[PDB]
Design a protein around this ligand. Structure first.
Ligand SMILES: C[N+](C)(C)CCO
Length: 271
């Protein structure tokens, strides 16, 4: 039984269901989802513990700064190479090449608010920053390297008030004028659907967040058919497609498993 870990993000559940289904289509391996994992730390500890054999979604910038204790590399190619080499060297874990998308933190406002306050970049927020309410996820305020503390020393301002909440709620919160700005995730389909505006990170504070699966080399050796299955998804999901997939769950309220199945069917399970 191949155990597949999903973080409690819509995107993680879709991709975990996708891996599960493709595995059972291609092979005789049985699969189980391990859901609601709180963070990459919980994920990483679960894999060290043998509780999961596959992380469906891990993000180069997040593990670089937290699991590996390293400085936030800002170049995508370099950050991915560093994460790949370190996961091999430290754990004999294989951090695959990316699905094809970067899911980054992104400061997001409405188009009405942008035009009113004259906002195109994150730096544009500085001028009235104490008047603003920012909605953020439940972990960002406390993160090291790529969190609020680092944000403040790079950008040289803080927001009037910051509200930590479940990520899924920040999209409606900003549409509804409850928050003035939110730290959204770039792959959420609600940015498109709600016509929200992503602000340029003009000081390149955030590292890249290219998304990949992670699997111990030991699991890959035990089940040699498994690598080829995962390889089918590498490079197949660009950010536009991930946004579309996410919205099917968060906007149309479909089950991650339904959304993953229709995607695999559209692409003929990549053979
Ligand atoms: C998706 N992010 C990279 C934005 C944060 C970690 O989950």
């Amino acid at each position: 039984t191949i155990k597949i870990g999903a973080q409690s993000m819509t995107e993680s559940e879709i991709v975990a269901n996708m891996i599960a289904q493709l595995i059972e289509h291609d092979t005789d391996l049985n699969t189980a989802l391990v859901k609601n994992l709180g963070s990459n730390y919980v994920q990483h500890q679960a894999m060290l513990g043998g509780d999961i054999d596959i992380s469906a979604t891990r993000y180069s910038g997040t593990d670089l700064t937290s699991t590996l204790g390293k400085e936030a590399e800002k170049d995508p190619k370099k950050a991915l190479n560093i994460v790949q080499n370190e996961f091999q060297k430290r754990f004999s874990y294989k951090w695959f090449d990316s699905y094809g998308f970067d899911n980054t933190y992104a400061f997001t406002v409405t188009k009405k608010f942008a035009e009113k306050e004259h906002i195109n970049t994150v730096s544009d927020l500085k001028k009235n920053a104490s008047q603003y309410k920012l909605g953020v996820d439940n972990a960002w305020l406390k993160r090291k390297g790529d969190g609020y503390k680092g944000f403040v020393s790079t950008y040289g301002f803080e927001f009037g008030t910051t509200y930590p909440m479940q990520i899924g709620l920040v999209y409606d919160a900003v549409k509804n004028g409850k928050m003035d700005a939110v730290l959204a995730y770039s792959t959420d389909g609600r940015i498109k659907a709600y016509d929200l505006k992503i602000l340029k990170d003009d000081k390149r504070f955030f590292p890249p967040y290219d998304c990949s699966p992670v699997i111990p080399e030991k699991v890959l050796k035990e089940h040699p058919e498994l690598e080829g299955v995962i390889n089918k998804l590498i490079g197949q999901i660009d950010t536009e497609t991930m946004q579309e997939l996410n919205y099917e769950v968060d906007g149309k309220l479909k089950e991650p498993s339904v959304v993953a199945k229709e995607f695999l069917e559209k692409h003929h399970y990549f053979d």
